[PDB]
Amino acid sequence: EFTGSPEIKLKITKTIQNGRELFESSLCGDLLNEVQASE
């Protein structure tokens, strides 16, 4: 079983990176399956 959630949302993480500080779009990327066959 999975019970995986799609949701069309971008989590804008207020980050500080580069010579110019920029905040970038991401998502809730946990619970990886990454291919199956022995199931």
Binding site: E7, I8, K9, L10, K11, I12, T13, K14, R20, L22, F23, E24, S25
Partner: protein, 96 residues
């Protein structure tokens, strides 16, 4: 040796104003939410300036709770706000 000088002057006029442009609030299709999300995703971090700004402007609970990790939930936002994302992106795509 005596004078009489009465003087009364009183004016007002300021009816020059024009600003009231409403949002469409048009029915944004689920396919349009996904397309809009991808089209904003390909825009770099400083282009996301207006994107996040109007999301914090409409949605104040995100502004106070998470100023860091701001979940812009396109599929469950206001169609007015999604029209603001639409207005920005197409102005920033369609040159001239």
């Amino acid at each position: 040796h005596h004078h009489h000088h009465h003087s009364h002057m009183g004016k007002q006029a300021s009816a020059s104003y024009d600003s009231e442009e409403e949002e469409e609030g048009l029915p944004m299709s689920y396919d349009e939410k996904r397309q809009l999300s991808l089209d904003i995703n390909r825009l770099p971090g400083e282009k996301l300036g207006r994107v996040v700004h109007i999301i914090q402007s409409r949605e104040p609970s995100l502004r106070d709770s998470n100023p860091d990790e701001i979940e812009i939930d396109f599929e469950t936002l206001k169609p007015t706000t999604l029209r603001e994302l639409e207005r920005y992106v197409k102005s920033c795509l369609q040159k001239k």
